[PDB]
Design a protein around this ligand. Structure first.
Ligand SMILES: O=C(CCC1CCNCC1)NS(=O)(=O)c1ccccc1OC(F)(F)F
Ligand SMILES: [Cl-]
Length: 79
């Protein structure tokens, strides 16, 4: 799918960044320790490692499984 507006409402299952890296799961603290967990943020759809925009960025993003790259925008297009 594409995402609407800034992607805050996106709930698809895409999990890949603009550089081809894989999204880290929101519930996981490895490789990146963070606070953006579904426990902490229950209505933002932070399911598995799916691309999401819980913080009003400008597109869906995720923490990445590359330990040297904390987060990236996902390879999704605006609708
Ligand atoms: O490190 C990040 C990612 C921050 C980026 C994500 C893309 N939008 C710009 C900020 N988030 S974090 O570790 O949870 C985090 C770390 C410090 C402050 C806030 C914060 O997010 C939250 F508010 F949820 F606690
Ligand atoms: Cl959307």
């Amino acid at each position: 799918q594409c995402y609407h507006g800034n992607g805050q409402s996106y709930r698809g299952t895409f999990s890949t960044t603009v550089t081809g890296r894989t999204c880290q799961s929101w519930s996981s603290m490895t490789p990146h320790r963070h606070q953006r967990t579904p426990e902490n943020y229950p209505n933002d759809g932070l399911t598995m490692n799916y691309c999401r925009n819980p913080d009003a960025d400008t597109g869906p993003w995720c923490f990445t499984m590359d330990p040297s790259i904390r987060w990236e925008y996902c390879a999704l297009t605006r609708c």
